[PDB]
Amino acid sequence: SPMMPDEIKYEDYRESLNLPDIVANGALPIGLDYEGVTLQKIKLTEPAMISSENPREIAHIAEIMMKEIDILNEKYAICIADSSGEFKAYRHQVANFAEEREDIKAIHQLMIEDLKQREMDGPFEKDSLYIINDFKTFIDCTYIPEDDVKKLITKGPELGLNILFVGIHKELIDAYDKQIDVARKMINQFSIGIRISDQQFFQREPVIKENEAYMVANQAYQKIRWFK
Description:
The protein is of the alpha/beta class and 228 residues long. It has one domain. The protein contains 9 helices and 10 strands. It starts with 9 loop residues before the first helix and ends with a strand. This is Type VII secretion system protein EssC. It is found in: Cell membrane. Belongs to the EssC family.
């Protein structure tokens, strides 16, 4: 009957669980579940939404996501639309980093041109990985049509184009912006850093503590803790 260790540091599990090899095989190792104390992963082969109730937790999410930056760049052309700043520490280590309004607007056109070329000419040698930090502001800069969001989510993965959406839960999942509603209904992979009782879209439920989240997929959830 395994139980969660007092501390679960990324720097230790990286070695004992060979986490760089997890990234090399197409997933981000993010933490352990409370039920089985087994490795939890965000698949880089389908979209995901990663939220937290607290803005300081977004900085930690970014730190864990980007741990194996050399393997990520080996496998992916990475483009980050970061309207908030939590990914700035990696701005020189991705193919494209956009933080100004006009540069974020250009990411919309880039994503569509990327998807189009992959459909016409076939997937590129490296997959494309778009990380959108603050989808609400991304929408404010791009006015990306809901049908463009739909086609990127539905067609992208089979063509080698993937998107990860990161943000505050009330600005990312429980917002009612049209494109957010479309994304949350089509995506089947979530890490939610807030009580299910404290959110709208999805025994007294305990408080969500530091680094804790619910992994949500297939109409089911599991409480986890992200690596430290």
